[PDB]
Amino acid sequence: KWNKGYSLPNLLEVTDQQKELSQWTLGDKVKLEEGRFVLTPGKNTKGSLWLKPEYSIKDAMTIEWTFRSFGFRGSTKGGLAFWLKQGNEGDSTELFGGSSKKFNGLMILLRLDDKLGESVTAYLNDGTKDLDIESSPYFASCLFQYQDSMVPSTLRLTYNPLDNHLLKLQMDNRVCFQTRKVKFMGSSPFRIGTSAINDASKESFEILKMKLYDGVIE
Ligand SMILES: [K+]
Ligand SMILES: [K+]
């Protein structure tokens, strides 16, 4: 059902890290520890997980990330990003440990937004300008509690070009937003990943599971 080539293996069940994670790039301080990835294991650390192969959609797709933030509740500029990006590259991690401020794609961000607070905010960039997280606009949002939970959450992104590019984003099976503004994935290969950065308070951003499906799931 899920596309193994564009998913994480069951992390707990991994016996050969090198073989079963061959399709993934571990960036910066991310470590596999007792069955999950800790993106930000230390004070003021960054980490990322990126799929090596670019993904080309057939009809529709679903991406499900299972994540949590553990160990810290309070004020911080740290956050956790989920990315769909297209076009060339660079090695920048200036934006949430994951990207240049100038990128072409979609960033779905869990952070303390300066006006919403604890939230999911979704941003599009077309590669021509620097995203300033304070002043650049997001196109969609919801309020969502994530700090300091052992209990993980699932972000589910469904995207169907055949339904005029309907993208739905659910958090724990509840709709955060729906949009038809994100169209680039229908007609171009793109890269899939996640990244996070914390501060000295040592917020632990963690990835427990990731699955991609070559369709819209019931
Ligand atoms: K690897
Ligand atoms: K903003």
d(CA 29, CA 36): 14
- Determine how many CB atoms are found less than 10 A away from the CB of residue 181: 11
Amino acid at 163: D
Taking the CA atoms of residue 14, residue 11, residue 190 and residue 19 in that order, the dihedral angle to the nearest 10 degrees is -10
Contact criterion met (CB below 8 Å) for 81 and 109? yes
| CA–CA dist 36, 145 (Å, integer) | 21
First and final C-alpha spacing in the chain: 12
Q: Give 160-183 as a 3 state SS string.
A: EHHHCCEEEEEECCEEEEEECCCC
Q: What is the residue-wise DSSP string for 4-44? A: GGGS---TTT-S-HHHHTTTEEEEET-EEETTEEES--STT
- Ligand with smallest separation from the Cα of 22: 1
Q: How far, in Å, CA of 18 to CA of 70, rounded? A: 27
Method: X-ray
Query: Which range marks the domain in which residue 55 is found?
Result: 1-218
Ligand at shortest distance from the CA of 114: 2
For residue 162, the tally of other CB atoms under 10 A from its CB is 11
Cα distances (Å, whole numbers) of residue 95 to 31, 102, 103, 169: 20, 9, 10, 21
55 within 8 A of 188, measured Cβ to Cβ: no
Cβ count near 171 (within 10 Å): 19
How many domains does the structure of the chain reveal? 1
DSSP state of 99: B
Contacts of 161 (CB under 8 A, 6+ apart): 57, 59, 60, 183, 185, 186, 187
Model resolution, angstroms: 1.5
Ligand 1 center to 210 CA (angstroms): 15
Contact 55, 6 (CB under 8 A): yes
**CA separation, residue 32 to residues 11, 40, 141, 154, 200 (Å):** 8, 11, 30, 19, 21
- Which CATH number covers residue 126? 2.60.120.200
Q: Kindly report the number of other CB atoms within 10 A of residue 4's CB atom.
A: 12
Distance 21 CA to ligand 1 centre (A): 5
- Strands (DSSP E) contained in 71-143 are 79-85, 104-113, 117-126, 140-143
Instruction: Tell me the two tokens of residue 145.
Output: 């509690």
SS3 label, residue 122 = strand
CA distances from 188 to 84, 103, 184 (A): 11, 15, 6
How is residue 110 written in tokens? 């869990």
Ligand 2 center–CA 75 separation, angstroms: 17
With CA atoms as reference, report the closest residue to 166 among 150, 151, 174, 177: 177
